[PDB]
């Protein structure tokens, strides 16, 4: 026809500028601020220089020879371009799968598997990454060659094309290329994003609650009351010497410990403490009857406020707790906001009694909806590369089985969009973080 020239060049041009403008944007930002630089956003940074390479190394050298109808580069860089082309697949999407691996391990097995968020086997496995990929790709450059094909009135002119020696050999690479791209990428990213998103929903309890109320101190230190605490939260003495905490703490654990402590025994601490607060709900027999009539996000702020003040000291709230046997949210929160526990500690008071009120999780669920965001962008990410490239590999599959039908129903330009479709990918998740924004 006649549009399509003109089309092409608008849409292969916005998409061309669009990659190149936000890739190295998005390279800028982070190569800037190295605070910008987690484990998830070096291999987003990994998955952005792909991107580049694609749309620098492989996109004019596909068009253009493309609106021309004639490949008129060299040979080597019909071999080059086409090399450079699987290798930013290949890249791409193992870093995608390299994400999921990485999330999954920061959220389903957080203090589990800390091997995985080491930034420096973020290196490690991205440099392994790109080695592999031009390894396995090298086929390209080695059996990408012109074929000589004459346009009307033997107009000579030459066509970049990937031929291996015979169609069983095709056929072989492009499943082989599907298996370890797409199929096996895509369930190992599909089991990781599910467990993902299976903890997500799960929500917050109270020991996250409680790590939010109360943080980690490693060294020994003071309550809003003045007396010794350690860790998260753990009461070691009242009286003012700091010779009897050092003392109270040694027995916490074993050794001598000397005022500072490890991560891994404040949370053993902490879930003797847990432990301890639930137990004194129950033996108190003026909570319990409170405790049986709550349900489970009630029940962590009356545990929150055990494991603050104590079971003698919170079974006092005899007012209060009243009107939470009684089911009278609003009520109960009005008085406890006029209580000392309060006035002491107002900011880890008004998100207890929010939880009291409302009987959600909306007072702590900061930390879970921003790592939702998160995931669910990769989720989109992830959903559109596939989106983008399954076109022009099932179209390359479809022509190592049926080269005659393949050919037959895309040459023209259902194959010129399936390919831009392709280069689309580059340039998308740039606008992706920009709308991450406002
Ligand atoms: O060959 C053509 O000129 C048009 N074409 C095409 C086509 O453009 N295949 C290409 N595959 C890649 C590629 C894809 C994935 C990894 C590495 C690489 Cl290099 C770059 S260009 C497929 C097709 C099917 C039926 C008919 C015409 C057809």
């Given at each position: 026809?006649?549009?399509?020239?003109?089309?092409?060049?608008?849409?292969?041009?916005?998409?061309?500028?669009?990659?190149?403008?936000?890739?190295?944007?998005?390279?800028?930002?982070?190569?800037?601020?190295?605070?910008?630089?987690?484990?998830?956003n070096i291999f987003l940074l990994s998955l952005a220089v792909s991107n580049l390479m694609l749309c620098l190394f492989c996109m004019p050298f596909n068009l253009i020879p493309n609106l021309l109808k004639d490949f008129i580069f060299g040979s080597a860089v019909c071999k080059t371009t086409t090399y450079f082309m699987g290798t930013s697949v290949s890249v791409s999407t193992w870093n995608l799968v390299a994400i999921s691996l990485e999330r999954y391990g920061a959220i389903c097995k957080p203090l589990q598997s800390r091997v995985?968020?080491?930034?420096?086997?973020?290196?490690?496995?991205?440099?392994?990454?790109?080695?592999?990929?031009?390894?396995?790709?090298?086929?390209?450059?080695?059996?990408?060659?012109?074929?000589?094909?004459?346009?009307?009135?033997?107009?000579?002119?030459?066509?970049?094309?990937?031929?291996?020696?015979?169609?069983?050999?095709?056929?072989?690479?492009?499943?082989?290329?599907?298996?370890?791209?797409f199929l096996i990428p895509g369930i190992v990213m599909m089991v990781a994003y599910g467990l993902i998103s299976?903890?997500?929903?799960?929500?917050?309890?109270?020991?996250?609650?409680?790590?939010?109320?109360?943080?980690?101190?490693?060294?020994?230190y003071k309550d809003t009351e003045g007396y010794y605490t350690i860790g998260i939260g753990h009461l070691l003495t009242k009286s003012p010497s700091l010779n009897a905490a050092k003392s109270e703490l040694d027995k916490?654990?074993?050794?001598?410990?000397?005022?500072?402590?490890?991560?891994?025994?404040?949370?053993?601490?902490?879930?003797?403490?847990?432990?301890?607060?639930?137990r004194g709900i129950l033996?108190?027999?003026?909570?319990?009857?409170?405790?049986?009539?709550?349900?489970?996000v009630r029940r962590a702020a009356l545990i929150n406020m055990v494991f603050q003040m104590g079971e003698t000291g919170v079974?006092?709230?005899?007012?209060?707790?009243?009107?939470?046997?009684?089911?009278?949210?609003?009520?109960?929160?009005?008085?406890?906001?006029?209580?000392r526990w309060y006035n002491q500690t107002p900011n880890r008071?008004?998100?207890?009694?929010?939880?009291?009120?409302?009987?959600?999780?909306?007072?702590?669920?900061?930390?879970?909806m921003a790592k939702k965001r998160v995931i669910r962008m990769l989720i989109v990410i992830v959903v559109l590369f596939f989106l983008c490239w399954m076109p022009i590999f099932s179209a390359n599959a479809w022509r190592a089985y049926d080269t005659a039908s393949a050919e037959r129903r895309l040459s023209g330009t259902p194959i010129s969009f399936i390919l831009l479709l392709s280069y689309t990918s580059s340039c998308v998740n740039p606008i992706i973080y920009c709308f991450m924004n406002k």
């Open positions: 026809k006649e549009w399509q020239p003109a089309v092409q060049i608008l849409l292969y041009s916005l998409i061309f500028l669009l990659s190149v403008l936000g890739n190295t944007l998005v390279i800028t930002v982070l190569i800037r601020n190295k605070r910008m630089r987690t484990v998830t995985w968020q080491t930034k420096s086997h973020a290196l490690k496995v991205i440099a392994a990454t790109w080695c592999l990929s031009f390894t396995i790709m090298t086929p390209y450059p080695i059996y990408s060659n012109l074929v000589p094909f004459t346009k009307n009135n033997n107009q000579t002119a030459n066509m970049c094309r990937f031929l291996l020696p015979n169609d069983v050999m095709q056929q072989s690479w492009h499943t082989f290329l599907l298996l370890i791209l299976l903890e997500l929903y799960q929500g917050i309890n109270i020991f996250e609650m409680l790590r939010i109320d109360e943080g980690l101190r490693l060294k020994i916490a654990i074993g050794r001598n410990t000397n005022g500072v402590i490890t991560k891994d025994e404040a949370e053993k601490l902490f879930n003797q403490d847990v432990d301890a607060a639930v033996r108190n027999a003026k909570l319990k009857p409170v405790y049986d009539s709550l349900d489970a079974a006092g709230f005899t007012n209060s707790l009243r009107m939470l046997q009684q089911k009278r949210w609003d009520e109960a929160a009005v008085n406890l906001a006029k209580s008071a008004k998100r207890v009694i929010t939880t009291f009120r409302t009987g959600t999780w909306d007072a702590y669920a900061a930390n879970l």
